[PDB]
Amino acid sequence: MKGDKDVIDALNRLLTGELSAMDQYFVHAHMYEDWGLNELYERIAHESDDEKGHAAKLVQRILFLEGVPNVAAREALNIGSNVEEMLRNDLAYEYKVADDLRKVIALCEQKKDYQTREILEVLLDDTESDHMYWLEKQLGLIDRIGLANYLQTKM
């Protein structure tokens, strides 16, 4: 079908976001593995895979809506140097993705594009209930047990 032009633009911005998330989670997972923190490596790598799944869904939706997916553009990556900084960068970036997803869900509701709305609602449900919540839990655990105890659990 012929999708709304604004809906395709917003879907393409969400795609740029998901692809940047994929890159950041990829390099962070491998920085965790380089440090022997295999549990964080595995968690962040699976989150990069989920970002790849979200990007696949967005690309499929943009192509179905007869748009041109933009997989070339990338947002600036915020790579941390230590575990707390990388977790806080992942959290900042999940917050930005959730905000942008909410804006696009509102737009899809105004533009009557309900099916894009539920695709983005599944994406927002993953962003909130899968990894924003996990990151907030991790930062709270660092606050409770300390960073050295927290990192000991991640090996």
């Binding site: 079908m1 179905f64 009557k112 309900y114 099916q115 539920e118």
Partner: protein, 157 residues
């Protein structure tokens, strides 16, 4: 639960259109079987079964909302003579039915009928996956030609 009269009317109209879709898809599936195009048979038959499930859900929702399901009325059927015409008729009907579903989802949201809206959103995603398939078939006919495309439909799997 006593539903809104407007929501029940919209559900009954979506039901009329789902029943018309069932009939058209089954006639087209059996016209395809009659020509030996078995994979097209299979697709159109599973699509008619799918619209069958959709009509079932709409009937159950109209009954739960204390309305009267209207299975008597049907819309005009667009029956094609050849494969391309049948696929175009199916496309036109999917597009009309998607417009109808979007209007009904808008009205269901305006009336705070949110489970009617969830029902209609499932019907919308299904109808729009079939729209995707029909557009794929048209692109494939444009790419490989109608004779090559029809040759790929001879065997069901």
């Amino acid at each position: 639960m006593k539903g809104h009269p407007k929501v029940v009317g919209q559900l009954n109209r979506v039901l009329t259109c789902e029943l018309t879709a069932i009939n058209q898809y089954f006639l087209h599936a059996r016209m395809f079987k009659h020509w030996g195009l078995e994979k097209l048979n299979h697709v159109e038959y599973k699509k008619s079964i799918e619209d069958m499930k959709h009509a079932d859900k709409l009937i159950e929702r109209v009954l739960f909302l204390e309305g009267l399901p209207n299975l008597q009325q049907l819309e005009k059927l667009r029956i094609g003579e050849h494969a391309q015409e049948m696929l175009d008729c199916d496309l036109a009907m999917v597009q009309e039915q998607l417009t109808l579903l979007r209007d009904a989802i808008t009205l269901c949201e305006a009336e705070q009928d949110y489970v009617s809206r969830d029902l209609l959103e499932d019907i919308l995603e299904d109808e729009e996956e079939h729209l995707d398939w029909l557009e794929s078939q048209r692109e494939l006919i444009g790419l490989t030609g109608i004779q090559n495309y029809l040759q790929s439909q001879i065997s069901e799997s």
